[PDB]
Amino acid sequence: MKRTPLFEKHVELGAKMVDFAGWEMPLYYTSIFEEVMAVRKSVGMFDVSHMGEFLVKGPEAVSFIDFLITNDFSSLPDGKAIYSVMCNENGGIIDDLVVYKVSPDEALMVVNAANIEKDFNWIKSHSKNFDVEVSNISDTTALIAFQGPKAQETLQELVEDGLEEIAYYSFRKSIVAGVETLVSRTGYTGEDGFELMLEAKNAPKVWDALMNLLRKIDGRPAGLGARDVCRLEATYLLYGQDMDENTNPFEVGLSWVVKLNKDFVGKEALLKAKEKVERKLVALELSGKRIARKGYEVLKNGERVGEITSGNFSPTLGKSIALALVSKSVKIGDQLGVVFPGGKLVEALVVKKPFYRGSVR
Numbered sequence: 001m002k003r004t005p006l007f008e009k010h011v012e013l014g015a016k017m018v019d020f021a022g023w024e025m026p027l028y029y030t031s032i033f034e035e036v037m038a039v040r041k042s043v044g045m046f047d048v049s050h051m052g053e054f055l056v057k058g059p060e061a062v063s064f065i066d067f068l069i070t071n072d073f074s075s076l077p078d079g080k081a082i083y084s085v086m087c088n089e090n091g092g093i094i095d096d097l098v099v100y101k102v103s104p105d106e107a108l109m110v111v112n113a114a115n116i117e118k119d120f121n122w123i124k125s126h127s128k129n130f131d132v133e134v135s136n137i138s139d140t141t142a143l144i145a146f147q148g149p150k151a152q153e154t155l156q157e158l159v160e161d162g163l164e165e166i167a168y169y170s171f172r173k174s175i176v177a178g179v180e181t182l183v184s185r186t187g188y189t190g191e192d193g194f195e196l197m198l199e200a201k202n203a204p205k206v207w208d209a210l211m212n213l214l215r216k217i218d219g220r221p222a223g224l225g226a227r228d229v230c231r232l233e234a235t236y237l238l239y240g241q242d243m244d245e246n247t248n249p250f251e252v253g254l255s256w257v258v259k260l261n262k263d264f265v266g267k268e269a270l271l272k273a274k275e276k277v278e279r280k281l282v283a284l285e286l287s288g289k290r291i292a293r294k295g296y297e298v299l300k301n302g303e304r305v306g307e308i309t310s311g312n313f314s315p316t317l318g319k320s321i322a323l324a325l326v327s328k329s330v331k332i333g334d335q336l337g338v339v340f341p342g343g344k345l346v347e348a349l350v351v352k353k354p355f356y357r358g359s360v361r
Helices: 007-012 032-041 061-068 113-124 151-158 200-217 224-233 267-275
Strands: 016-020 023-028 044-047 052-057 080-087 093-103 106-111 133-136 141-147 171-176 179-184 193-199 279-286 297-300 303-314 319-327 335-340 344-351
Touching: 007 023, 007 200, 023 032, 023 224, 032 044, 032 224, 044 200, 044 224, 052 061, 052 113, 061 093, 061 106, 080 113, 093 113, 106 113, 113 133, 141 151, 141 200, 151 193, 151 200, 179 200, 193 200, 224 303, 224 319, 279 303, 279 335, 319 335
Parallel strands: none
Antiparallel strands: 016 023, 044 141, 052 106, 052 133, 080 093, 093 106, 141 193, 171 179, 179 193, 279 319, 279 344, 297 303, 297 335, 303 319, 335 344
């Protein structure tokens, strides 16, 4: 499996390793629940160096990005990032991502680990008519997520610039624990927090410095187990589980990242798609302790209405929770049934999204 520049650190901390998108990653260090608690109460630090980063440099960086993504990038000012999806000609989601507008001549794209190759090939196969050069810097770049209600007050000590100034989804080049870092107020937890992008060679030192601070505030390093629990609670999506090329943005609650007033790949397909949205992604709270998994059939009074996309147990709400892609007819308050292996039906209630809103700005 692929190894992050922090692999040795994880093993040393005694984390239980798991395979994620071909990467050898920490499922947890102590326990999934203790790590989720850390994120919800103090600080949870995640190694997300498996994420990919692409650089788009050139006079037409802005137009190129605006052409590739569904969200409006042509308006973003320097130092601002944007969440979006990138669609194919048929409106299918190739991947969701975050693009940083460094300057009119430079944009940075952070994409999902499992999609680095697919994404990069797609982006490069579309740079032809744009005065830009696209490069993949993933191989030498690391990314650390410092998340929690106490993330800022804890991290400040090591950052030479004021974190307060950095607004939600804004970023700034600064120095962290003595190394150049691209610091953004972004996250996947539902709590306040930042992501620290840096040269892979400097990841070990930054991680150790941060670990030092965590022990002081009773925070903790957090693995993929806690990452999935927190993102699901926050009701954020995970490409491949909740959406893929067989779903368009409107079907999974991402209409807000699609701006049809501009031109982009998949535009025409999406105009038509918007006219007939036949599916939706709903939040479910199941009865019992069993966790629903992707693919489990979801029924309404005995008739199929869709299927589970993501499932897990939320210690924050003390409930088995799930996301499910179902027919447009399903509404909040409905009593559904989830078919577990062996045909066992488990009751589920449709609830308003998101399950939980923390300290995120």
